[PDB]
Amino acid sequence: VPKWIQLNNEIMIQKDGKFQFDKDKEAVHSYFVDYINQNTVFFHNLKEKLDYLVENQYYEEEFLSLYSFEDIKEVFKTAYAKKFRFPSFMSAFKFYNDYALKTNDKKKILERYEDRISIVALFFANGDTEKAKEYVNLMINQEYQPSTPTFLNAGRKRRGELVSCFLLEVNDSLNDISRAIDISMQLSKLGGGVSLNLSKLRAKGEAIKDVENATKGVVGVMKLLDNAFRYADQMGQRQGSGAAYLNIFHRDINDFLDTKKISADEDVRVKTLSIGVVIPDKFVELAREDKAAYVFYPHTIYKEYGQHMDEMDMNEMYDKFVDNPRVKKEKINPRKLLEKLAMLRSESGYPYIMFQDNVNKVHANNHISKVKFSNLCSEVLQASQVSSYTDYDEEDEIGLDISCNLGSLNILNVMEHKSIEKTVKLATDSLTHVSETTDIRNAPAVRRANKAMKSIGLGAMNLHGYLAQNGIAYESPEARDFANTFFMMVNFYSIQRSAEIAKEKGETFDQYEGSTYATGEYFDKYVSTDFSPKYEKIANLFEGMHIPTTEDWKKLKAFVAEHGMYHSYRLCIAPTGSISYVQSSTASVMPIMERIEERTYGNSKTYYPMPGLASNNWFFYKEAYDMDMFKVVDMIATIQQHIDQGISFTLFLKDTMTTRDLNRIDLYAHHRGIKTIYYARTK
Amino acid sequence: VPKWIQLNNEIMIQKDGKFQFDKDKEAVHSYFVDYINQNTVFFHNLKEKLDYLVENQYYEEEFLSLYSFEDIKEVFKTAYAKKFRFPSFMSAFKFYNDYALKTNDKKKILERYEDRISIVALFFANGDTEKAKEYVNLMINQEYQPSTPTFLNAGRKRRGELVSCFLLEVNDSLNDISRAIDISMQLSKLGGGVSLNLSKLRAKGEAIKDVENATKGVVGVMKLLDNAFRYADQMGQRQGSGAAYLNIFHRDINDFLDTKKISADEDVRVKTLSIGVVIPDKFVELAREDKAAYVFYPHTIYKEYGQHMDEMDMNEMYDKFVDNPRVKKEKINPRKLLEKLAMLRSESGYPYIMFQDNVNKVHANNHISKVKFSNLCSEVLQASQVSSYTDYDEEDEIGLDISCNLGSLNILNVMEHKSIEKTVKLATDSLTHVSETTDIRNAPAVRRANKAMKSIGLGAMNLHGYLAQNGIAYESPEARDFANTFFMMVNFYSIQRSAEIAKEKGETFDQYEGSTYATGEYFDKYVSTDFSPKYEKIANLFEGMHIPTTEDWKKLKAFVAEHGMYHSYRLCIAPTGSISYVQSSTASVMPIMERIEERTYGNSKTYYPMPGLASNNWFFYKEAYDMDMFKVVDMIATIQQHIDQGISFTLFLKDTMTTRDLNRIDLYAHHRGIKTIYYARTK
Amino acid sequence: DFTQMFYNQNVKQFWLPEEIALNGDLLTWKYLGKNEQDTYMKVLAGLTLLDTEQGNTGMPIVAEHVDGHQRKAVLNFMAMMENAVHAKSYSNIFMTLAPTETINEVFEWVKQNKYLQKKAQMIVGLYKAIQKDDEISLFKAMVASVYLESFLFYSGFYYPLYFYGQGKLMQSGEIINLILRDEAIHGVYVGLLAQEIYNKQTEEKKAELREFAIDLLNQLYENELEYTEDLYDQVGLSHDVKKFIRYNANKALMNLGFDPYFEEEDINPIVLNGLKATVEPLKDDDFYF
Amino acid sequence: DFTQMFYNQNVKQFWLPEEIALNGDLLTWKYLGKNEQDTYMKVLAGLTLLDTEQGNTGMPIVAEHVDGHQRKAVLNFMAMMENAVHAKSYSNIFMTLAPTETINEVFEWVKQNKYLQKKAQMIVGLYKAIQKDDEISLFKAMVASVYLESFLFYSGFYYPLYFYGQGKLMQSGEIINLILRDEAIHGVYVGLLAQEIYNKQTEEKKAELREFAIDLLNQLYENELEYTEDLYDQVGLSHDVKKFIRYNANKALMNLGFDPYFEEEDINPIVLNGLKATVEPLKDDDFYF
Ligand SMILES: Nc1ncnc2c1ncn2[C@@H]1O[C@H](COP(=O)(O)OP(=O)(O)OP(=O)(O)O)[C@@H](O)[C@H]1O
Ligand SMILES: Nc1ncnc2c1ncn2[C@@H]1O[C@H](COP(=O)(O)OP(=O)(O)OP(=O)(O)O)[C@@H](O)[C@H]1O
Ligand SMILES: Cc1cn([C@H]2C[C@H](O)[C@@H](COP(=O)(O)OP(=O)(O)OP(=O)(O)O)O2)c(=O)[nH]c1=O
Ligand SMILES: [Mg+2]
Ligand SMILES: [Mg+2]
Ligand SMILES: [Mn+2]
Ligand SMILES: [Mn+2]
Ligand SMILES: [Mn+2]
Ligand SMILES: [Mn+2]
């Protein structure tokens, strides 16, 4: 057992009835005195290091060639002047095991934290030394964290794509299904998580070229996609991850759900394909009134109306579908379906729940399309247009496939530096740069939507960490007040930066003129409701920072009207799995699952306390499972009212609560305006 | 139970110790006087029938519009003038259950045998009334039988494709793999059996752009193809059938074979994809000498030499592969691999065995490409060039994917009518028409190969029926002499018709100038060796027909040199599974499995005696399992010497014999020049 | 050829009642109508009563007359599952859903019920008629046993599976599914033992045993139709239950190596949702001809 | 007052030999003398025979005649353990340690060994003499069963325990300890049932039953002495084993409610060292907040 691992395991050993949290710091020192410095490759000067990394195909020549060597050296010096120290052993371990650049033999460390941050900053700035230094100060203060793809791969020649969330629309044809399989394989090859909408696909027992009972339904397509994702597994590094979304009014919805049951046969169950269910308000109304619902055959609806079932508003179309004899449908019990969803989420955490009307009643780009499905993490909610992939030697009709750009603000570090505006604007600029530098040659609709929509996702993390280190309970009304104010400022500065980029470049996102930003509707609740903190403690937390008022929001609305907005979507709160360790932050805006988490690496045990955990804030670091899920829903809705896309919202349940409690949490989330529900993790 | 069912079951009720074969005839009468005539749909005249079939989307109106109604009436009258009667109940039952056109609800019979034959003939003639009458006389006499796709689907609006088998070359890339999956689904949707050569795909543990041990090998692609064929299953009517072919020198050859082991795990086992193994002469030489062999990693060979492992001759490059340190290889025991092949064929009948050198030592189009794999029935052996399917928005390099149209000569009916020449020429014309009117819009390499190669497959059926009905034992040297003479005549007249078509159209198949037809090498054994019958009985059997001599072959060689050949490939002997029932013929050139076969249909059981089975020819209808497989190999080699493509050669084994006997049969087949071995069916 | 394989499958399916917590069923039980609760109780009592006969007589009597140590062990294991596992499981379900007085009354009713008694006594009659060293009488009893395991239970299993497929009474439905999975393998195994006896007989004796099996099936089937209407008409399910009986009758026949008697039918989707050749090395000179 | 607790104890003791990997004994087995291996094989073969008959005959027949579904469930479970678990475990041991020919030879040896045949004849004879509704014949068979469980197995158990206690053949020894743990509770349970019948008798009848029990014990004992000498003389342990079987004879008598018959002796200290989530329906009030 290594010395740093012993020093880390000494945390659980209680002295005077208290955990030895400070010992973790010592572990970090050991982890750097015994391992990191010994296995870190050192060079006589930075010029030699850069030459070795470029020549050995570690870095890219293009992004480094935009700067003189003096500017690169100045950026590296700015990164190293902070003298950044990892506060916990797990932060440094996760960085140097997951993100630090290693030799081809994987035994030496080529990149420190400062080196990786400097390289990512130089990639972000695209030739501006001052902008690169600003990015270096942003990331070394740990105010902003690029996502795992961006942080890991920026500036590296041997790399995947910087985007890892991809949403694909699948049209109801064999050509479109095969193209979707191909694109899923190509994007998993790039290292991205792929979500596919299967609602347009006709159900099982439908007609193919006017022969009856011929379609295999969406379950056969799910089997094909599951095989494709198993095959494309990042060159045998990570398990291929894919998601499939189906509307709850699709007839296959039960069989869809049956793919996640343990009792399902081998020809029914898909193991590497996550599933999500899109639930329109009509289904919730039918379940609430206990009226029996109807699941429709999509192809009959398409033949009758010329549009797909998921392309029209089910609230106004459901009665017409039911009363139409030419539309084929099957009787179901919506309450039984809700109970089945709750039971499946209890067993396996699936499916993801998308409340379609909750997403689309605040969606700014409904003119382009309504949000029909979400991503693999159930937080990307954007307009998508299906593509018509025709036969060979025939021109395809390329639509819009969602691929947003991830990046997370560290709420604790951002707010302690009183730099919400600067961090949000710099993160928006970096996300815009990464979106502009993304070029996928095997996903035509993804590339077209990236060029047109210019959608980015700016998330936040360390919400619970910040609240606990400031003596605020996550379920307290003060925490929701802080979340409201902080995320309203984040939205304000994100919109301001998007409008500034649109003014500078002279271009907005495609079909912006029809958006609620152009019409000013988006700013309605912002020009009438003041989002300043209602509690003195939160106001003192925001001291030293200008909180945008209704007049500021009116000025921003006028600015957007005059200049437009560059990004169709700006904010989405991703789970932030492993980057939260490196940043010493709690994951996403979720409450912490455990105060101290026990992990097993190799044959060794390691202990990670939550950041800033001590005896004084032990009570404020309440575990997520012990919390009331209604108050967690309230906080997530408070944040969601300022996020244009969704939030990865995992439910944290105890083994005691039943499926009725899960359904109640889901229905309260639907009532409170929650757009997506990610997971049902049972303790 | 139906009256005809009782009459057919009365065959096995012996009277005076003999089977009541004549009862079978009675059954047909019943089957027509109680079911077919009552279930048939009669019109006032042919005009009303044709109009009803045209407007109700049963028939394509284009092929019928090329004839005036008087000509169509004359063709139908020619078909009905023969007064064709089905001699066995099973012939009529199979036609009216599998090939006769029924209504949309399948409650009535719209097409008689004469109606189907007339429609197929009118489609074949393409506006020529005299040619349509010739086709009608050829098919109503049952001298020639179009394949099941062509016979069933010719002239139908709801038809599929007339091509039975498709062969795809899969290049070593994710884009090519995805395109192969798409094309396999498209062609299975069209109803054709798809064969894919996986020998170019790099083995398991190869590098995908400098990251090693990343590839899943051919087994992952096999699983993808298996799921694709499961999904595309002819709209749920016929199970999707696919074939995978791998060279025996591929490193994955064991894992490949492990897909068919009955103890294979679900993550490896493949159940809807047939497997074939391509064995060069080098492997047989290594096994014979007991020298340990080496299987190779295709990607290392491609990197070192710039060509795929199956793209070059292993007999001359195996030592270079072994001595090359930059080529990666694994040690295997070739005798152990042969024993594994024999055990697998005993257990499940797989893999198909393709003796590559036996195919390519007489292959006429080696300049275009060597034959690297076979079809799903292991009888199509043609040159194929792999396609380079590139990224989206990039032009693809379209290669040649094999596809040929099947058609079988009924040997008994052809020789009874003394019309080898006329039947062969008319069948060649019909297959040329089927190739010309075939246009597949989702398989580009298949379309290009169909347009360029113009390859057709003219098979033969009722070899054993003709031999047994003429008092010739199938294993006798007289039977092999008859096969030699008959198939030399078939080859002569097929080459003559191909050259005549090339002369009349002024065009040959692509790259004909480099073929052995153009250089005259193909005719060598035909201009030096006489293939006239060596036995007086066979010569009497061939009386009334001009058997080509060496002078006729020299004249044909000169004619080909002057005019060329329209078809790259002309003769391939398919299994002819279910259409042999309608023709009252034994399946293909294979010996009969059983004298009387008991088949269960619905809740009833039926007995089909072999065509012409009686007391005097009971022992001439020797069952295949009771026959010496070495003499069957001799027969198949004798036929194969006159067939440019392969023959679907099924091995018929007894349970008592061991895997060593199967290996001996395989090695004798390789020694005798057998190109492919189809199945190892054990009694 | 088969006893060790069945031994393995049997012992690896071992389970105990205590593993499934039953109390959470009360959360759906309270929402069923009186007719639904009545049918469920009656079906449950029917299964309980029949399974007791199988544990006390059916399996032990067959184990007694079958020769072979390994077969006796497998049969003993199956008898154990009836008496120690299944019987306790049925009792547990009852005690959870009904008070003591209600349980006693339901069993009094089902004990007097004409259709339940007819089938119970028909099966028991054949077990009592087995004679020492007479393989014909043993075969007849095995046929009766297969009919119970693979056919007669299924008019009863229908209802718990119907609820289980709808998300109702999930804990007791899980228990029933485990029981049913045991009875399926019991039926297949006893079926193979019956085929062994059948295959030792002359052609005339075989035809006579086939007639026995079909005649017995017919008697039981006609009583099942009456049993079915008696229980399921009040909840409107009898048509679909009848399809399920015929489908399972066909499985029972196939277990006995006989052809299906009834035409193939589709089953209620809710209930569906609830539900070497000798290796010889190459010796060389096999490559030369 | 006791069946339920025996039911719970029996089912909680459930095990399969496959749970214990046996390849660890391969070396300590290889190292034993030919005499030691011979005695060991034969000892386990004698045990296999006893469990074969206890499972096939003894436990099922007693189950048939004992009244009460719970008592029958315990006896059925014990029967299953005898032939499906215990008897089979010995074959697992044999198949690991010995070549097929040695295994074949030892099973041939049980058939021709006069002491093993005599003890089987005597015990099985009493089982097959049970008459329906005749409690005295049942008592006699239960005495025989207790003597098999608590006395007769022990001439066999000695040797695996003797090795286990020296740290030899410890995986096989683990199996044997599990078997012994089962037989101890089987002997107590059957003993309690025998006492029930004995306690119903007149004093005169009781006196005769004690005579039967003691005469039977002495007859079995005298045969076991000869069996013990036959097996253990070649390994030098006969006198030690004899002390062990007398010790266990007293335990068998005690299980029957009788006083010890043999005087206490020091036993070899080596041998002593050898010893889904809950589901609720959705209410209309859960849709409003
Ligand atoms: N907690 C930590 N986080 C990150 N790096 C660390 C940490 N502890 C030590 N190191 C690394 O090890 C070096 C030694 O640091 P130490 O605590 O011994 O003193 P120092 O004054 O920071 O040293 P130096 O002269 O290297 O700057 C640091 O410069 C840094 O590179
Ligand atoms: N074996 C058969 N094959 C094909 N069609 C048959 C067969 N048997 C009967 N039919 C059909 O059923 C009709 C019944 O007539 P059948 O053969 O009994 O003799 P028919 O009335 O004297 O006239 P004909 O033989 O001249 O048609 C036939 O005309 C024919 O259309
Ligand atoms: C992407 C991917 C490829 N492969 C295998 C199958 C293909 O035959 C083979 C080639 O993939 P390619 O698509 O050719 O990958 P590449 O072109 O980026 O890499 P290279 O330059 O080396 O050609 O890699 C996998 O096994 N799994 C995968 O996920
Ligand atoms: Mg379409
Ligand atoms: Mg490549
Ligand atoms: Mn039972
Ligand atoms: Mn049972
Ligand atoms: Mn025992
Ligand atoms: Mn015992």
Side-chain angles (χ1 to χ4, degrees), chain B residues 163 165-168 183 187 387 389 398-403 438 440 442-452:
Chain B
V163 188
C165 50
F166 308 100
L167 292 83
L168 309 181
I183 295 170
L187 293 167
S387 301
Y389 298 113
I398 294 309
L400 300 165
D401 274 346
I402 305 150
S403 148
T438 291
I440 288 160
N442 268 297
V446 171
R447 172 146 101 201
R448 163 162 127 86
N450 187 74
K451 231 168 302 289

Side-chain angles (χ1 to χ4, degrees), chain B residues 363 393 438 453 498 609:
Chain B
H363 184 214
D393 256 17
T438 291
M453 311 309 291
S498 205

Side-chain angles (χ1 to χ4, degrees), chain A residues 287-304:
Chain A
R288 177 191 317 132
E289 285 125 32
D290 222 345
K291 309 151 136 63
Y294 285 98
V295 281
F296 307 99
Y297 288 72
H299 189 225
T300 74
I301 282 179
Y302 184 80
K303 287 187 303 250
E304 174 68 18

Side-chain angles (χ1 to χ4, degrees), chain A residues 379-447:
Chain A
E379 105 278 344
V380 182
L381 297 172
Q382 304 189 9
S384 43
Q385 287 168 353
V386 80
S387 302
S388 284
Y389 291 106
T390 58
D391 305 335
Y392 206 84
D393 80 350
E394 213 198 325
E395 223 57 39
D396 307 302
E397 167 268 293
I398 300 309
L400 300 173
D401 275 4
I402 300 146
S403 63
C404 92
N405 197 5
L406 258 44
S408 295
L409 313 167
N410 196 308
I411 296 170
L412 178 129
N413 294 322
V414 164
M415 273 265 312
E416 65 173 343
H417 285 93
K418 297 171 190 313
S419 72
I420 286 175
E421 162 179 6
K422 161 214 88 174
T423 310
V424 162
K425 295 202 170 184
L426 268 166
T428 307
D429 294 333
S430 72
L431 290 174
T432 305
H433 169 82
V434 166
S435 180
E436 287 155 343
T437 53
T438 294
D439 228 9
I440 297 169
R441 337 290 280 283
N442 271 328
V446 163
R447 169 176 46 181

Side-chain angles (χ1 to χ4, degrees), chain B residues 262 284 287-288 335 338-339 343 346-347 630 657-660 663-664 667-668 671, chain C residues 259-264 276-289:
Chain B
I262 39 62
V284 187
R288 164 193 314 127
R335 285 204 185 179
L338 264 186
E339 292 163 9
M343 164 249 300
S346 304
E347 298 173 331
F630 271 43
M657 83 180 34
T658 62
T659 67
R660 185 245 212 229
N663 270 332
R664 251 192 82 72
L667 295 162
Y668 184 63
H671 165 71
Chain C
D259 295 331
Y261 193 63
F262 299 108
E263 62 174 41
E264 188 156 56
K276 194 62 110 192
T278 280
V279 186
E280 166 173 32
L282 276 175
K283 316 225 193 303
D284 194 21
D285 315 297
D286 292 329
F287 296 89
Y288 300 96
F289 312 93

